[model samples]
Target: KVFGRCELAAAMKRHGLDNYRGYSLGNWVCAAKFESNFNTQATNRNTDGSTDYGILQINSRWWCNDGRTPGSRNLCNIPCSALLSSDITASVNCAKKIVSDGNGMNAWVAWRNRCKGTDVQAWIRGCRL
Candidate 1:
């Protein structure tokens, strides 16, 4: 990663994140670690033409292009990492907001408040949102 440990710690401190929204910083780091092994260019199998791309696992062809061709309006952008230099969360959050109408933080908040219980799927389904 471009960021050194001290630099990353500083940035995380500036963000006021003692931890990730739902996961601890170490846990959050491991998510990226195991998911793509810190490779920014990583991609994964999804389906025919539907695949993950980049560190955050964004699929622009499916989420962005599909929306443009007379269907849903979920325009998935290529992400800031493609242009800007930053951590995976920046790009992941961008993709999330594109799909969540900027309610991404609310989703995390919901997870913290409601989904902490067992069977998070059932808990979220029962939630009012």
Candidate 2:
């Protein structure tokens, strides 16, 4: 089930995820809304035989290995299940590493297709920034 958007923002803010590197809080908020609607346990099986896990929908192709994805790199050094928690610390950390690797928000198709280069401010509307 989806969690409260404000609560998600509060958690992300507490973890310094309100802004990561150059990405804005609004971008993150927009991605989360489209990717999983703030649902901690969200999962989606991709057409490429890989699965996206958790709130940010981190991929199994390189970021994590859930044992179902062949040739997974597990670059985040964590099981996919770890990202599916309300705490979201692990997912945020992994996301930081992912962006650090150069993909930035482009790592998520949801962001590329829906949030990128768009007016994402509404995602953080009334969230007090």
Candidate 3:
């Protein structure tokens, strides 16, 4: 599913991502905007041989098992394909694991480069959520 920017903002907010791990909801929306353009089925193979999947682009190396990545930790204990579903519950919950503790939202290079220290309110502007 391809989500409109504001719609995705609403979805993430409904999932309890606002102020999650001290990062604003805008941060999550922006990360997904750049990472997958809000496409649920987005996937990218990394140079390190790991694959990134789903709207948040959770990686296969440490968070999910795809039966393809080398030395996968499967820390999220979910099949990589689950992240590609329209139901974002799994993806959002798994991302919580990735950002747990002081590990930080830097888990997504996209957020680090685009959302951090920027005016993120624009991403959700005019969205009546």
Candidate 4:
């Protein structure tokens, strides 16, 4: 319930994401659509014993701890539950750090598989940003 498509786009824009790390807003919108459908409570367990959290699907193996995993490299210093909150600032900040780590939007499989080189304009179409 944190955001609809348009709201999410606006929030990202307010957070200075319209053109971040050399990636377009279309890249983020499209990836978030596939990743969590803009749902903040989203969680997915990976085959590698890690979990993805929130809209951007930040991974527990490197970013957040789910309390079930040991030795997690939680560089973000925030709980996985924080990502599930309706307020997305923490999650957005964490995602920024992840992108800064390397490869830009390629950090997300959703972006790489479905958004990269694709026509993602539809993701932001009709949004009042």
TM per prediction:
0.44, 0.93, 0.96, 0.94
Pairs of residues at least 3 apart in sequence or in different chains that clash in candidate 3: none
> Candidate 4 at 21: error in angstroms?
0.3
Local accuracy of candidate 1 as per-residue lDDT tens digits, 39-122: 666656554555455544555443433232333233545432351235544545554453355443332332334423334232
Tell me the tens digit of each residue's lDDT in model 2 across 94-120. 988887897788988889999999998
lDDT preference between candidates 2 and 4, better one: 4
Model 2 pairs whose backbones collide: none
Using TM-score, rank the candidates from best to worst: 3, 4, 2, 1
Query: What does the lDDT read for residue 91 in candidate 3?
Result: 95
**What's the lDDT of the predicted structure labeled candidate 4?**
0.87
Q: lDDT per model, in order?
A: 0.41, 0.86, 0.91, 0.87
Predicted model with the maximum TM-score: 3
In model 2, where do residues sit more than 4 Å from their true spots? none
- Residue-wise lDDT of candidate 3 within 10-108, one digit each (tens)? 888899888898888888989999999999999999999999999999999999999999899999999999999998988999989888946688999
Q: What is the full ranking by lDDT, best candidate first?
A: 3, 4, 2, 1
Give the number of colliding residue pairs in candidate 3.
Answer: 0
Where in model 1 is the C-alpha error above 4 Å? 1-18, 61-76, 79-92, 95-129
Q: Give a tens-digit lDDT track for model 4, residues 56-77.
A: 9999988987887666898898
RMSD of 1: 9.9
